[PDB]
Ligand binder design. Structure first.
Ligand SMILES: [Au+]
Ligand SMILES: [Au+]
Ligand SMILES: [Au+]
Ligand SMILES: [Au+]
Lengths: 301, 301
């Protein structure tokens, strides 16, 4: 029993983290096979970050200016190229700890584990979700850029995030492992606002199911509702609109608990309209939306 | 910026997790050097658990009845002994992935990372605290016994917990790596109640400091208070009594923020007497008490 925000084991990714230094800046890189991936703004000075022309800045960089260090050993850079907002540094040694891996671009609402690193050394691991506005509410300090987010399914590490930026509002932005930013953000120190941060409705429902499975059931009411009618309440409270696809993905949890998806929606409705009256669900006094239905099934089996 | 409940990187401990089977039961063991540690109730049938005599049950067990498997390779058991509530299985092969490590018995209020495993394979990692009643609010399912809790300082893994039991109330009990249970619990399926679960006052104060560092400051009032007078409020709300030792440990956080410890206590006082009026602190609608002052400094530096 018990329900905790649980990250994936971090070992396979720890073995891939290296330190990358281009003149003054040092950040983290990801060493997979004989390529090191890192944020392209490693080539920038804190002066450059206001409006850098990365193509021009790269012209004055050669292989030997990129110092890559795994632990305490230097790797020899034999090639470099820019792909979108990441640099791919070709080294002469394949990482002997390369796991089976894929690069995946995740959708908003999906969750993943982040291994926060500084100067190529892991510091800690935690679970996050890609917000609907494409930001993440991370814990990152200077030098954490290049840290990656991932999922582990069986023996394959699915890399889905590389950390790039902290926006002025204290939230975080980054790219997939092909260097494309999530959302409208750019690797520039400027005014870049996040959109409205809606709540991930499907995850809230999944978490309510996890609560029922693990003993907390006070919030179960006698009501039911319809998709359209629930979505009117969702819209008012800035929740993602719930779709039939969402209903279907909740089916297994619906079967396990014997609570129809629309009955659970009516209970959520009441929670949104009436609050929690100082009580708690799974140790939280608010509605948690960073558990996917998959997360709930995996942790509950 | 940002503040997250962050576990230690799990890699060094993953390499130590094995599967241990004694007749029907299979649980997790910890393979360090040429010894495998596991809960002694591996030798029990679900029938035995009501009131087992472990000494007698062990008499009918020989080295070859304990099957220990790291990944997909068997380890050869050349000796076994019972120390308190753990078995120490001597094997003929030292674990090549043994990290630098220590066994530590932690005090209530201190935090650690748990690597939840099943059949010797890691499933996930999360951060917990040893409650003042010596229980932990974990996420454990059948077969998770033998999973361990640890801290990582530099290159040394400090093992502090091994999981044994789920009490009827859904909380968890276990031992240090010398096999001594935390609190009054025993490895028996019986009526074993947890005491009153008081809140870890010093951790709450540390977390409020983390909030100030990371932008949330609405809860800072104009008041101050005294230790004795605050402790009267703490007692009423079932908070740990705050001591001068606690004040001293908060000193570094007190210096970093410029908020005197007793001023922060007066703010907490108000939070306890008046609630949070629907607002939040670091994304929580309640007072978090599973961050130590050390946890806050490490994550904030
Ligand atoms: Au793969
Ligand atoms: Au950075
Ligand atoms: Au040590
Ligand atoms: Au068990």
């Amino acid at each position: 029993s018990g329900f905790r925000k649980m990250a994936f084991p971090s070992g396979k990714v720890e073995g891939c983290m290296v330190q990358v230094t281009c003149g003054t800046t040092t950040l983290n890189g990801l060493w997979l096979d004989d390529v090191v991936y890192c944020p392209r703004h490693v080539i920038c000075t804190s002066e450059d970050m206001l409006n850098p022309n990365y193509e021009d800045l790269l012209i004055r960089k050669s292989n030997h200016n990129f110092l890559v260090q795994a632990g305490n050993v230097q790797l020899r850079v034999i090639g470099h190229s820019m792909q979108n907002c990441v640099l791919k540094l070709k080294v002469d040694t394949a990482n002997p700890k390369t796991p089976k891996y894929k690069f995946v671009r995740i959708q908003p609402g999906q969750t993943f584990s982040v291994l926060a690193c500084y100067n190529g050394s892991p510091s800690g691991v935690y679970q996050c979700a890609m917000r609907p506005n494409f930001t993440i509410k991370g814990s990152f300090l200077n030098g954490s850029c290049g840290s990656v987010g991932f999922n582990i399914d069986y023996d394959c590490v699915s890399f889905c995030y590389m950390h790039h930026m902290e926006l002025p509002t204290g939230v975080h932005a980054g790219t997939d492992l092909e260097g494309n930013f999530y959302g409208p953000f750019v690797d520039r120190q400027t005014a870049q606002a996040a959109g409205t941060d809606t709540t991930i409705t499907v995850n809230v429902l999944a978490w309510l199911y996890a609560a029922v499975i693990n003993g907390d059931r006070w919030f179960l009411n006698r009501f039911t509702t319809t998709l359209n009618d629930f979505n009117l309440v969702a819209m008012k409270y800035n929740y993602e609109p719930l779709t039939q696809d969402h209903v279907d993905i909740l089916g297994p949890l619906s079967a396990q608990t014997g609570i129809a998806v629309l009955d659970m929606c009516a209970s959520l409705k009441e929670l949104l309209q009436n609050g929690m009256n100082g009580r708690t669900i799974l140790g939280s006094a608010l509605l948690e939306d960073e558990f996917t239905p998959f997360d709930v099934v995996r942790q509950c089996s």
